[PDB]
Amino acid sequence: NVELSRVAVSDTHGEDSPYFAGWKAYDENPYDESHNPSGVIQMGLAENQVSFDLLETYLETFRQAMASFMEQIRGGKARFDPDRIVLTAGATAANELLTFILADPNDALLVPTPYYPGFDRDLRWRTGVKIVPIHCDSSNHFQITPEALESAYQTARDANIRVRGVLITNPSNPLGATVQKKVLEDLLDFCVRKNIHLVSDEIYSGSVFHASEFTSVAEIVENIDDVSVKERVHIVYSLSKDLGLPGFRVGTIYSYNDNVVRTARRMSSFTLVSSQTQHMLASMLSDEEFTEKYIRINRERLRRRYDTIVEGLKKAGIECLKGNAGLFCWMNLGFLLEKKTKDGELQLWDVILKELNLNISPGSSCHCSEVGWFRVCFANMSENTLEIALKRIHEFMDRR
Amino acid sequence: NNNNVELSRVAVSDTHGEDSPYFAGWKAYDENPYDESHNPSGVIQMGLAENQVSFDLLETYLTFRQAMASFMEQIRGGKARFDPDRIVLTAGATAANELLTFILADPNDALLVPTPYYPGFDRDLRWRTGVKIVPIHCDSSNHFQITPEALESAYQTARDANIRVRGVLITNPSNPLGATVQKKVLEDLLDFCVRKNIHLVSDEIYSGSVFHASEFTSVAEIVENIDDVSVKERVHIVYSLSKDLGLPGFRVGTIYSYNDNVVRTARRMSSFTLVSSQTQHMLASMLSDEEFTEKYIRINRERLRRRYDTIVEGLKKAGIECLKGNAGLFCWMNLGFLLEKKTKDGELQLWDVILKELNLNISPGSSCHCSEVGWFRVCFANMSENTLEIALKRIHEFMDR
Ligand SMILES: Cc1ncc(COP(=O)(O)O)c(C/N=C(\C=C\OCCN)C(=O)O)c1O
Numbered sequence: 161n162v163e164l165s166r167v168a169v170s171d172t173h174g175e176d177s178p179y180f181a182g183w184k185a186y187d188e189n190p191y192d193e194s195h196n197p198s199g200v201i202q203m204g205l206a207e208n209q210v211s212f213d214l215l216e217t218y219l220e221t222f223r224q225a226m227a228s229f230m231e232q233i234r235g236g237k238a239r240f241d242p243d244r245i246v247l248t249a250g251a252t253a254a255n256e257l258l259t260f261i262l263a264d265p266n267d268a269l270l271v272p273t274p275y276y277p278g279f280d281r282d283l284r285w286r287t288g289v290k291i292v293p294i295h296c297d298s299s300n301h302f303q304i305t306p307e308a309l310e311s312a313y314q315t316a317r318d319a320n321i322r323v324r325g326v327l328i329t330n331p332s333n334p335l336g337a338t339v340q341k342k343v344l345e346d347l348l349d350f351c352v353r354k355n356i357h358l359v360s361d362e363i364y365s366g367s368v369f370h371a372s373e374f375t376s377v378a379e380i381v382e383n384i385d386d387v388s389v390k391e392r393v394h395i396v397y398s399l400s401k402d403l404g405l406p407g408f409r410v411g412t413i414y415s416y417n418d419n420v421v422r423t424a425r426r427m428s429s430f431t432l433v434s435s436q437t438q439h440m441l442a443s444m445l446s447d448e449e450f451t452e453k454y455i456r457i458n459r460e461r462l463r464r465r466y467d468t469i470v471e472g473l474k475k476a477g478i479e480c481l482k483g484n485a486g487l488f489c490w491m492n493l494g495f496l497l498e499k500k501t502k503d504g505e506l507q508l509w510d511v512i513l514k515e516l517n518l519n520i521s522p523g524s525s526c527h528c529s530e531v532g533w534f535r536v537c538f539a540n541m542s543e544n545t546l547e548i549a550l551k552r553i554h555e556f557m558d559r560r
Numbered sequence: 561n562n563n564n565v566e567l568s569r570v571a572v573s574d575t576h577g578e579d580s581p582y583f584a585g586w587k588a589y590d591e592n593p594y595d596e597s598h599n600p601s602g603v604i605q606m607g608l609a610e611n612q613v614s615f616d617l618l619e620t621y622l623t624f625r626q627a628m629a630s631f632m633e634q635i636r637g638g639k640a641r642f643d644p645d646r647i648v649l650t651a652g653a654t655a656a657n658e659l660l661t662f663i664l665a666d667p668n669d670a671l672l673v674p675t676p677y678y679p680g681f682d683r684d685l686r687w688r689t690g691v692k693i694v695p696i697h698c699d700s701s702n703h704f705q706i707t708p709e710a711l712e713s714a715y716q717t718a719r720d721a722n723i724r725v726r727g728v729l730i731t732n733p734s735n736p737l738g739a740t741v742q743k744k745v746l747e748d749l750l751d752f753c754v755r756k757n758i759h760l761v762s763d764e765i766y767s768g769s770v771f772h773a774s775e776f777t778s779v780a781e782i783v784e785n786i787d788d789v790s791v792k793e794r795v796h797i798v799y800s801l802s803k804d805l806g807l808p809g810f811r812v813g814t815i816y817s818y819n820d821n822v823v824r825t826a827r828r829m830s831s832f833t834l835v836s837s838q839t840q841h842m843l844a845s846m847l848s849d850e851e852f853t854e855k856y857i858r859i860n861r862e863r864l865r866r867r868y869d870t871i872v873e874g875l876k877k878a879g880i881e882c883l884k885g886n887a888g889l890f891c892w893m894n895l896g897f898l899l900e901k902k903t904k905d906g907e908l909q910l911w912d913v914i915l916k917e918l919n920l921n922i923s924p925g926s927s928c929h930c931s932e933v934g935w936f937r938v939c940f941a942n943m944s945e946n947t948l949e950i951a952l953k954r955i956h957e958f959m960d961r
């Protein structure tokens with residue numbers, strides 16, 4: 161019999177986590193308004209369909225379009241030379257691709273907790289790079305401290321792991337929260353001192369609720385004119401989340417480093433975007449009058465939905481983190497828990513899954529330093545399916 | 561200052577292959593590309609193996625795994641069954657080949673690959689994966705086909721130098737040779753793989769472009785009859801739409817693997833290189849349609865064949881003998897005894913005269929790792945009727961002087 165590679169038989173792909181085991185129970189009997197109203201409702205998949213009718217109602221080289229549409233998201237606060245854009249088949253493809261370019265097998269990336277539980281696959285699986293978690297907690301809304309960067313750096317060098325860059329998510333999945341200007345430039349400054357790359361995964365940037373509150377790492381870069389420090393940062397964007405077009409698989413790497421783009425271009429061979437979809441999204445994304453209209457209404461709609469989910473959970477006795485972005489909220493069932501530990505979280509999540517019939521991302525899958533938090537998505541469902549889901553959790557709390 | 565950021569070994573590695581002749585030709589092509597009206601004296605591209613001879617049929621025409629399975633069945637002529645549940649879509653074949661290599665081999669382990677091969681394997685297989693290639697050596701003494709003795713030879717090479725070997729990756733039909741592999745050598749190679757306990761990977765990307773349906777033998781043909789699960793799970797097939805359909809920008813390649821354990825790892829690993837669902841949706845009905853895919857593949861086979869005929873007949877009455885080919889989008893022509901120095905440097909110097917003086921891009925055999933000096937791949941399917949007769953008349957009147 162034939163063996164396969166270490167990588168092949170490695171269980172770093174992550175299909176044993178809670179995250180997936182939820183998706184499996186969802187399919188066992190998915191919710192349906194007419195035909196299965198007691199069925200399980202999906203709130204663990206961070207997808208955006210609240211603004212889809214606008215694209216749908218629309219449709220009755222391409223780098224330039226992608227550059228505009230990025231400019232429009234950031235509000236002329238960035239310039240984006242279409243010649244540095246490198247198309248890759250989704251962000252998951254961009255993040256991995258960068259990691260090959262930015263780190264050796266066994267070297268590391270610092271990643272603030274909580275993070276996208278899917279990084280455990282993307283960054284690690286084929287690349288051989290490790291993650292060292294930068295530890296963050298609810299004492300400051302889970303934001304990156306200059307001391308917790310140093311702490312997590314020392315962790316790596318304590319164990320002979322070279323560190324090669326830090327990969328934040330801006331705005332943060334799962335926190336649903338922008339990072340403040342002041343912490344970005346603080347982090348960039350950390351990167352020149354340690355001589356590493358800053359990777360910004362700006363995938364939720366059209367889904368930040370108020371345009372003024374979002375600070376892209378592009379904002380902190382084309383003003384500071386040292387080529388040495390410019391070439392550390394790189395931006396990873398995709399259409400998957402803002403446009404809600406995740407199956408079209410268009411992500412990009414915009415990198416402020418001449419040497420990356422041309423390696424990233426050659427490396428894109430392995431993960432190209434279908435030219436047919438490039439062609440057919442070109443005019444739309446290029447069209448200022450539309451992208452302006454779209455992003456304004458998307459911001460609002462996502463915001464207005466966030467409001468109803470936290471108000472719902474408020475008058476049922478659940479306080480969420482003060483969020484201003486993303487397609488989800490980061491709700492606290494800390495002091496609403498049995499055992500106050502990791503096993504207690506996984507046991508509570510199994511009651512939510514089996515009894516509420518409700519899929520929710522548990523904080524332990526996100527590597528949260530703190531026990532008892534949960535990501536609940538809201539943008540992959542109707543108005544009505546949310547009020548059902550809220551009424552399900554409202555009347556679960558009644559039984560206390 | 562002096563506080564500059566390094567990149568990875570892989571990043572600064574020159575295994576991406578943009579120093580070869582292959583690319584340096586593409587760069588001189590752009591300097592002034594050929595154009596019938598605008599500028600004919602311009603350089604003609606015969607180094608890019610692309611198919612546009614049968615495109616007007618798709619143009620005049622216009623889950624999804626089921627379509628891809630049918631279309632593959634139609635290419636092989638019901639000689640394969642293809643469970644759509646084993647198909648794993650990847651963004652092109654270059655993405656499939658790499659993806660498999662991660663699944664089939666560790667960093668520093670090897671793959672045996674018969675020479676000559678797609679010079680782009682030097683990137684695909686090696687670059688991110690850390691695997692090496694050991695060439696299986698083939699020569700014109702038997703039309704560059706794989707011998708059981710040259711497999712053993714190239715295996716020993718690896719084990720001589722402590723390189724574990726993990727599978728062999730043939731191209732069927734062969735790029736650049738333009739030539740099918742015979743049934744007898746495939747099953748001979750499959751037998752080699754059970755004895756050494758390795759995988760056989762078949763890159764069947766040119767399979768709709770083999771000229772006569774009866775002459776092509778897929779590794780799928782040699783497998784669903786032999787019913788040992790042990791030996792079945794060694795082979796894997798890599799196909800794409802890029803070359804037969806001539807739809808290379810839509811980036812749809814697939815891995816069909818006869819190994820339960822691969823498909824589910826290959827599926828999870830496809831995350832990194834997915835096919836746009838929009839193109840999947842819009843190619844679905846077409847590829848599913850038997851009446852059309854039958855008609856298409858018959859005419860494509862013929863058209864590619866009829867073009868091959870004119871290119872070798874052209875080169876014949878100008879004194880160039882090509883290899884007897886029956887497939888692909890190219891021919892493997894011999895300028896061995898039509899050369900100055902008879903060595904690698906002599907080939908690269910001859911190719912620079914063809915590029916600068918003929919104004920003609922042609923893949924030199926040295927880029928393809930050919931064991932033998934002086935051969936060249938010349939593509940023909942990425943150009944009109946007329947641009948070929950110009951290119952032929954250019955080489956005809958070079959031989960005159
Ligand atoms: C920060 C971040 N980066 C990248 C991606 C990948 O998206 P791409 O452009 O490659 O489609 C996601 C999607 N994360 C959500 C997952 C979506 O579906 C994939 C399922 N694992 C989630 O639930 O957090 C994300 O949240």
Ligand SMILES: Cc1ncc(COP(=O)(O)O)c(C/N=C(\C=C\OCCN)C(=O)O)c1O
Pocket residue numbers: 607608609610651652653654655678679680731735763765800801802808811812813
């Ligand atoms: C054996 C083999 N494998 C893989 C590929 C990659 O094709 P994909 O399915 O990824 O589109 C090619 C095409 N090789 C040609 C390259 C074509 O370039 C495409 C330009 N976009 C060549 O010149 O040899 C090939 O001959």
